[PDB]
Write a protein that binds this ligand. Structure first.
Ligand SMILES: CCCCCCCCCCCCCCCCCC(=O)O
Ligand SMILES: CCCCCCCCCCCCCCCCCC(=O)O
Ligand SMILES: CCCCCCCCCCCCCCCCCC(=O)O
Ligand SMILES: CCCCCCCCCCCCCCCCCC(=O)O
Ligand SMILES: CCCCCCCCCCCCCCCCCC(=O)O
Lengths: 122, 122
């Protein structure tokens, strides 16, 4: 769920995830996908596509379990949808950390998300 | 200060630092040093020794800056005492992570700390 996602991001990046990503770029947080603004945004794009291929569980609502093992996110549990959901979220959190070096405060409150360029199909 | 310390520990271990370590073993948390019970406890011992090297800053009260970069604690700032203090704190949070594999819940609430064998000199 949103709660696990927000936690992973906080863990990998050290940043308040809602403040740093809740309205970041064209893909991060509220809203849909759009053409990525930068590497950070592209992480979020890839993440929302990752959600699209899931069946059998609800990405936003359904909790799943994961652990923080040697400062590594490790997804927990069998149920094929929830595992894949966890892997989606993990990959985003790592991706956001890998790309903090180009994080742009400028894109942080992108209230113009409805105006992002449409995204390619996943 | 205690707040930076408890934060570094949460960050490295993912564990509630007051609950996991506030009264753990003979060295962790409240009180002085004693003979370490385990690897975890040894971390805390080394840590308290580290603080004795510090002159003219107060480890419990004095705040210092540090960052979380690439899931690494990085100590911030010049003032030779605060720097050394932060490095003490970082070393212990890594140490505790490194030793989670032998963390024992049985040592967690050691109200019996005044009965710990006396520490050797640092
Ligand atoms: C509900 C999912 C469980 C996830 C396991 C982690 C348990 C609680 C961990 C919370 C701290 C994460 C450590 C990473 C450090 C980020 C810095 C910070 O806490 O401000
Ligand atoms: C409204 C709140 C403002 C900013 C904080 C909330 C962040 C929104 C979280 C939605 C994230 C969606 C994750 C990908 C998706 O489910 O499509
Ligand atoms: C579901 C119950 C509420 C849980 C509280 C969650 C609070 C944190 C949620 C906001 C996290 C920021 C989301 C950024 C996600 C970027 C990746 C993506 O948009 O696909
Ligand atoms: C003093 C004002 C800060 C109040 C905020 C509370 C945060 C406290 C967390 C304390 C956790 C300490 C864990 C024990 C540290 C082990 C290392 C050692 O004992 O030398
Ligand atoms: C938690 C309460 C205090 C933790 C002890 C931190 C350092 C020990 C000391 O001041 O010698």
């Amino acid at each position: 769920s949103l709660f696990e996602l927000g936690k992973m991001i906080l863990q990998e990046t050290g940043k308040n995830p809602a403040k740093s990503y809740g309205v970041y770029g064209c893909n991060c947080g509220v809203g849909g996908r759009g053409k990525p603004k930068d590497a950070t945004d592209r992480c979020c794009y890839v993440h929302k596509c990752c959600y699209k291929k899931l069946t059998g569980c609800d990405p936003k609502k359904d909790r799943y379990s994961y652990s923080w093992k040697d400062k590594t996110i490790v997804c927990g549990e069998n149920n094929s949808c929830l595992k894949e959901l966890c892997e989606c979220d993990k990959a985003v959190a790592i991706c956001l950390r890998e790309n903090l070096d180009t994080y742009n405060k400028k894109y942080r409150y992108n209230y113009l998300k409805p105006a992002c360029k449409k995204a390619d199909p996943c």
